């Protein structure tokens, strides 16, 4: 722990310009990383809103909200995902699941073998929009190759 007036990484780059990196694929990524801050992991909001019911919370976790689209955990009673427990009534030939509380809707596909059915787990745009900076050496190696 240093005493006095502590400063974060943004308060660090607030006073002294850090050195930059050469030109490779990750240069700008490195700079962005060094610049901003530390903070926890946040899944993409495209991912948490994928399964029905579940959603983030205020500094929160997998929230198994009660189940009430074309590829989530479809149920044969009310078309609801399996809240809190992905175990449902299925067989080796079943197609749609049925909750353990919805076992009144246990189904059976049109199959030949009688399998074990139970609690289981399953626009044109501009052709020139900007100027590009290049490096002389990649250009030179490109030319020599061609």
């Amino acid at each position: 722990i240093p005493e006095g007036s502590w400063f974060c990484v943004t308060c660090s780059i607030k006073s002294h310009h850090p050195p930059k990196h050469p030109l490779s694929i990750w240069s700008q990524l490195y700079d962005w990383i060094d610049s901003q801050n530390p903070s926890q992991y946040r899944l993409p909001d495209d991912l948490v809103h994928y399964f029905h019911g579940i959603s983030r919370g205020d500094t929160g976790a997998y929230k198994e909200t009660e189940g009430e689209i074309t590829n989530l955990a479809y149920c044969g009673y009310c078309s609801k995902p399996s809240m809190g427990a992905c175990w449902v009534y299925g067989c080796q030939l079943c197609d749609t699941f049925y909750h353990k509380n919805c076992k009144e809707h246990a189904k059976k596909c049109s199959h030949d073998s009688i399998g074990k059915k139970g609690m289981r787990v399953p626009f044109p745009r501009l052709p020139v929009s900007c100027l590009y900076k290049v490096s002389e050496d990649g250009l030179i190696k490109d030319f020599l190759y061609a």
Binding site: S24, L126, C130, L131, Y132, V134, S135, G138
Partner: protein, 284 residues
Amino acid sequence: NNDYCSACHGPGNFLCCETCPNSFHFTCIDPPIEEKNLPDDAWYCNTMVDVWMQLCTYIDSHNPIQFHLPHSISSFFRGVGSGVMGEYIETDVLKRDPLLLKSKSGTPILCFRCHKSALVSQSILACDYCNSYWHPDCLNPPLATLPSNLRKWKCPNHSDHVTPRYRLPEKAKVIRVGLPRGFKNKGNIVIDFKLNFLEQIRDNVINLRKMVEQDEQLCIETFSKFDFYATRDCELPLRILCDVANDNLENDDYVLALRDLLRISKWDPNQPVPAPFDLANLLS
């Protein structure tokens, strides 16, 4: 009146107006007639789609005007501006003395190709996109005159003469391409004491003796060949003539002239070629 068309601001034969004094090219006017109106003219003196089509029908009584562009579409690309009568000009090619000897930055003014000044051939040219000077006699098309002193000139040593046309959105930025090979584009790229004076004098002396020995050995080997240079290079035309007059088809440079003759008379591949002497009656 005013002596400019009230639509396009142009000079010419005006249909003027008596009451509301303006001028129209009479085809820049209202529905073009053709011409020829000598008596008084008086050119136009006088919440749903319902009211907006009433706007449509109200546009009638307001004396036509030319079309230009909105401020957002003409002022969008780089180096594009309107004229004074609303035509398209390039504002990046705007703004001569033949004999220049020293620039105002106090440097010599020597051609980029032959290295000599504006005294061997009477005139020199200065590039506006570089720091290079050229003799109009050295460019390869040779300039017979000189450009105007109001448009900029561009020396032969740029790539703008081969990149086709692209126009830039005038607020684009420069994207730093970090991709260390195989980047595709079409030409829109920017690019990213000993204090020895005695040694210098000795350097120069020994270099000069090197050069002297070099040419002293060149002339030794050249000057002993004069006797065969003269013989062959001066009896050549008579050897060519002795080959042609004897009709040597083995002189592979004779039959190439014979093929030039077949290629001048535009021979048709159907007839047989003539004997090599009889094709020579193309010449006379």
